[model samples]
Target: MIHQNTIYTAGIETEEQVSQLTERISNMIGVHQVNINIIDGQVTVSYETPANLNSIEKEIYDEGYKIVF
Candidate 1:
């Protein structure tokens, strides 16, 4: 089981996009317990396990994407 606090945000496009992003983030963080959600054109990627958040953000930015907070 994974136990950790997560940071939430908004602004995603589609489920497929979220899945792609989630896979990327998981790979980057070396974890498989990550979570991604899209609601109302908002995407919330959460690091459900303790990991390097900076690396996660970098991966997101590197993918030519921006997190709206």
Candidate 2:
């Protein structure tokens, strides 16, 4: 099954940031797609069981981005 998650954060202020963030999540196992909205600072991911919400959020946080829970 495919699961979807959306996280809100800051520092998605540039196109480079968007691509970098997308690459990070896209590299994860089971992650099918990554969509980032700079206006709302939202990052959305589609993945399966091996790629979960917690891990995704943690990865974002570990990458030095602040996640708005």
Candidate 3:
């Protein structure tokens, strides 16, 4: 298992956004865990082979969030 740290450019201002992102990421195959820090605009993802950083970033992007590479 490996953890990837990513930063998004704001917009995560509510508990709804938090839960939404959390649930969405957690539902992905091979994604073991997800942690979103609203204050820092950071997302920490715990995943393995089938789960990769790009897909996670794309998932967040598809949800309408902008990410920092």
Candidate 4:
């Protein structure tokens, strides 16, 4: 099992969408490392953060993606 400091959930339409979202998040948070897994219709985002989860969530939503959890 992987234990991370933060786990975030979002739903993206496609793998390309996931790539775009991850890239934006990485840029905004200044972290090059990010993990993304696409299961069914859900995109799971996990990261080690020295940043705020809420802020990340908001940024993702603002980019026109839905947060699943």
- Reference-based TM-score, model 4: 0.59
TM-score of 3: 0.85
| TM-score of every candidate | 0.58, 0.87, 0.85, 0.59
Q: Best by TM-score, which number? A: 2
* Model 2 misplaced stretches (Cα beyond 4 Å): none
**lDDT by residue for model 3 (1-69), tens:** 676665564667888998998999988998887889988888888887788888888888888888776
lDDT of 1: 0.59
Of candidate 1, the 10-residue stretch with the lowest lDDT total is 40-49
Q: In lDDT terms, how accurate is model 2?
A: 0.85
User: What tens digits encode model 2's per-residue C-alpha lDDT throughout 1-69?
Assistant: 998778898766888978888898899998898999989989888999799998888778877788887
Tell me the spans in candidate 4 whose CA falls farther than 4 Å from its real position: 1-8, 30-32, 40-50
Pick by TM-score: 1 or 4, better one: 4
The per-model lDDT (C-alpha) reads 0.59, 0.85, 0.82, 0.59
The candidate 3 region of ten consecutive residues with least summed lDDT is 1-10
On the 0 to 100 scale, the lDDT of residue 42 in model 2 is 90
Question: What order do you get sorting by lDDT, best first?
Answer: 2, 3, 4, 1
Misplaced by over 4 Å in model 3 are: 1-3
Candidate 1: pairs in clash: 11-42, 11-43, 12-42, 12-43
What TM-score does structure 1 among the candidates reach? 0.58
Minimum summed lDDT over a 10-residue window in model 2 is located at 60-69
Kindly list the per-residue Cα lDDT of model 4 for residues 1-68, writing each as its tens digit. 22233344556667797788778767754344565566643334444454456666776788776665
